[PDB]
Design a protein around this ligand. Structure first.
Ligand SMILES: Cc1ncsc1-c1ccc(CNC(=O)[C@@H]2C[C@@H](O)CN2C(=O)[C@@H](NC(=O)C2(F)CC2)C(C)(C)C)c(OCCOCCOCCN2CCN(c3cc(-c4ccccc4O)nnc3N)CC2)c1
Lengths: 104, 152, 97, 120
């Protein structure tokens, strides 16, 4: 089954899909084709949990019920540049205004 | 027996299964012999019922609360196909893929009383969009004009 | 696949499949238009009036639309929180999607 | 001198039978007589009046017991059977109305037979 994700780093969000049975490494190959960084230069996270290459997306907790087209799951992304390992940093999106009185 | 979109008084029984595969309370709507819409008992989300209809009888399905249009076997109208060797005819009711605009109008209409539409801080053209509520009559007109234009 | 970049008023960059962005009539018109140097199409769109909380939500709609349009898989509802409804309505109206 | 009412026993038997038919609920608790209490009007359903020569409903039957139009249980039976056959002729085999009217004929015959078994 398909899982729908948002791969996020700083102010960049990639919208992509993969199978529940596909691995973290295969997801890194998708990011490679878009951002041109090989898998060994990438670290993927679920919240603050670093994701292991050999694990399937389903084993990471990305299922059809938690990673939907209309409500994708967030995958955090940090780059390694040789001896450099940046801290995982995802910039939050903006906030809507306060709900108007006529909508309460 | 006058409009293009109407049931035919066939008097040929046809067993149909109405299956609500949408998260909405469904209102089945039968078009009578004069093409006038008739409300039938509603179907809760996930419910199916084996019902009795007739060959050439025309149906459409709406959200019972808001009259938002729904699909039946991936289309707007349902007329049972040939009832072969007693087999019932299946009518699978689902949500359409609404445009983002239509879906937003639906959500706003569900939260805002019609007297308060014009209090919303949105472009003026959007007040008439909110006020242009889904209606089976306008849909019958669009579907009639589609068929009439198609007859060329 | 081919991807495009959509940029919110607050500078968030959303990378989505070109086919998914083409769901918007406004984006379709903007991408079809001539690009830079010899390119005949565009791959980047800047929205100076659509913030990131709304634009991310629009991209989720593009994913939902392409996944469920002409499908036999039962269709779920596209959810919209009350707090984002007005801004999302304004974005959908502008975007023609 | 035919202004004469039916003996109280005959009216009591007619009403007991018709009440059993009208009050009958299937195993799901549905009162099968609901649709048959009052006919659709000529304007609501003209196709009914174009096909059915002698329309009748349980309201006109109860009315015919009160105003002594039926002079025997057989007269009552003829009209209940007419109601049921009208419903069957109009709606045809397969419809719920057709099926409900079949059960109501059976409920009428059981009630009629209960009255027979109580006299002799
Ligand atoms: C459970 C549930 N959940 C979700 S949807 C649903 C559901 C689905 C179906 C039905 C019943 N089926 C139908 O009404 C089908 C559908 C369509 O094809 C049209 N049609 C018909 O029978 C037509 N028949 C014909 O074309 C013919 F019969 C001529 C061939 C009419 C013209 C409408 C009668 C249902 O039924 C329960 C709810 O009722 C629906 C609303 O209808 C109310 C109006 N109607 C009630 C019945 N009535 C009749 C009364 C009598 C009658 C009354 C008193 C005494 C004697 C009688 O014979 N006889 N026949 C009738 N049809 C006419 C008015 C509930």
């Amino acid at each position: 089954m398909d899982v729908f994700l948002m791969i996020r780093r700083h102010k960049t969000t990639i919208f992509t899909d993969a199978k529940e049975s596909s691995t973290v490494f295969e997801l890194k190959r998708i990011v490679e084709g878009i951002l041109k960084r090989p898998p060994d230069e990438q670290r993927l996270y679920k919240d603050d949990q670093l994701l292991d290459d050999g694990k399937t997306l389903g084993e990471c907790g990305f299922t059809s019920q938690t990673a939907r087209p209309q409500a994708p799951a967030t995958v955090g992304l940090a780059f390694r540049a040789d001896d450099t390992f940046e801290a995982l940093c995802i910039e939050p999106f903006s906030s809507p205004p306060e709900l108007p009185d006529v909508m309460k | 027996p006058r409009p293009v979109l109407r049931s035919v008084n066939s008097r040929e029984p046809s067993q149909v299964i109405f299956c609500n595969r949408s998260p909405r309370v469904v209102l089945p709507v039968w078009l009578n012999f004069d093409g006038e819409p008739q409300p039938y008992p509603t179907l809760p989300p996930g419910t199916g019922r084996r019902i009795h209809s007739y060959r050439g009888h025309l149906w459409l399905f709406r959200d019972a609360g808001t009259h938002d249009g729904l699909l039946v076997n991936q289309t707007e109208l349902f007329v049972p196909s040939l009832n072969v060797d007693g087999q019932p005819i299946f009518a699978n009711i689902t949500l359409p893929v609404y445009t983002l605009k239509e879906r937003c109008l639906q959500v706003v209409r569900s939260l805002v009383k019609p007297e308060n539409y014009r209090r919303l801080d949105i472009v003026r053209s959007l007040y008439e969009d909110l006020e242009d509520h889904p209606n089976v009559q306008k849909d019958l007109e669009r579907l009639t004009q589609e068929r009439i234009a198609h007859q060329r | 696949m081919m991807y495009v970049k959509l940029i919110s008023s607050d500078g968030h960059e959303f990378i989505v499949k070109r086919e998914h962005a083409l769901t918007s009539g406004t984006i379709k018109a903007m991408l079809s238009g001539p690009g830079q140097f010899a390119e005949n199409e565009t791959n980047e769109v800047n929205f100076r009036e659509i913030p990131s909380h709304v634009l991310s939500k629009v991209c989720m709609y593009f994913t939902y639309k392409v996944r469920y349009t002409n499908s036999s898989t039962e269709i779920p509802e596209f959810p919209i929180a009350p707090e984002i409804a007005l801004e999302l309505l304004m974005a959908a109206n502008f975007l023609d999607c | 001198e035919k202004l004469s009412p039916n003996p109280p026993k005959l009216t009591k038997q007619m009403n007991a039978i018709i009440d059993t038919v009208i009050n009958y609920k299937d195993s799901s608790g549905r009162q099968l007589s609901e649709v048959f209490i009052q006919l659709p009007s000529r304007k609501e359903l003209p196709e009914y009046y174009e096909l059915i020569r002698k329309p009748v409903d349980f309201k006109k039957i109860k009315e015919r017991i009160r105003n002594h139009k039926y002079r025997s249980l057989g007269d009552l039976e003829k009209d209940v059977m007419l109601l049921c056959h009208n419903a069957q002729t109009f709606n045809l085999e397969g419809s719920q109305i057709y099926e409900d009217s079949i059960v109501l004929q059976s409920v009428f015959k059981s009630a009629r037979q209960k009255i027979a078994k109580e006299e002799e």
